[PDB]
């Protein structure tokens, strides 16, 4: 379809950058006041916000990247965590969207917990801390590349892979342990296997150097997350992916075994 002239160059570049743009894996243990559970509540809320404003999934993924990098070097009290998230979503929207919501919308969606002044000051601080390095690789960026290797393309597989990649955003333990390209790999394989019974294609071993064996640790975690998704405290991604835009893929029954 699209001529693939720069596809390999870009893949290579993204593989370099995902290592550099990675947050610090154990950062939460050094936060005195916030926890992984609080982070999950924040990300789940950002899912809702993205739905309300009809934002791209990419924008959500970027915001999560910004948040984890910010919290990797800045101690934050629980009463300011939503401020960090809101400024992150604002910045992601400005980067990624054709029409980002205005700042007043970001204030509104917090029930006026913070002022416009506060959101704009936090924006400045997030930019400072991230040294304006906002063009981060995401799980979504790898997924869209992987989808070009379907035989043939399947809307349900794409939507289900997107769902699983998104679920990974919620749970810092375990998902901070894995790179975006690895989670995307596990998500794609699990989606393919669930919908069509197909597996990670040989063409993607060629492209990425990853095999089912190399993806296995992440795939085992993601399979458990998928199995347990209806019981998770956070449900916004499941609800989102029940809708027709996503072919109701969160209503599909997960495979009980992967036969690895």
């Amino acid at each position: 379809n699209e001529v693939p002239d720069y596809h390999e160059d870009i893949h290579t570049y993204l593989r370099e950058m995902e290592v550099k743009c990675k947050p610090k894996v154990g950062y939460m243990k050094k936060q005195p006041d916030i926890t992984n559970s609080m982070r999950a509540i924040l990300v789940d809320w950002l899912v809702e916000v993205g739905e309300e404003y009809k934002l791209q999934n990419e924008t959500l993924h970027l915001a999560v990247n910004y948040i984890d990098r910010f919290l990797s070097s800045m101690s934050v009290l629980r009463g300011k965590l939503q401020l960090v998230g809101t400024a992150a979503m604002l910045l992601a929207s400005k980067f990624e969207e054709i029409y980002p919501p205005e700042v007043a919308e970001f204030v509104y969606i917090t029930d006026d917990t913070y002022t416009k002044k506060q959101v704009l000051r936090m924006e400045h601080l997030v930019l400072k801390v991230l040294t304006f390095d906002l063009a981060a690789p995401t799980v979504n960026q790898f997924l869209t590349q992987y989808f070009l290797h379907q035989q043939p393309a399947n809307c349900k597989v794409e939507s289900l892979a997107m769902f699983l990649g998104e679920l990974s955003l919620i749970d810092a333990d375990p998902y901070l342990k894995y790179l975006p390209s690895v989670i995307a790999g596990a998500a794609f394989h699990l989606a393919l296997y669930t919908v069509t019974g197909q597996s990670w294609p040989e063409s993607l071993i060629r492209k990425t150097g990853y095999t089912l064996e190399s993806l296995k640790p992440c795939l085992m975690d993601l399979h458990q997350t998928y199995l347990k998704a209806p019981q998770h405290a956070q449900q916004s991604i499941r609800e989102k992916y029940k809708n027709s835009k996503y072919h109701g893929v969160s209503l599909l029954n997960p495979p009980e075994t992967l036969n690895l």
Partner: peptide
């Protein structure tokens, strides 16, 4: 708006 404003609550 469908989604109303919400102040997130972070209990222990």
């Amino acid at each position: 708006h469908t989604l109303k404003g919400r102040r997130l609550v972070f209990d222990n």
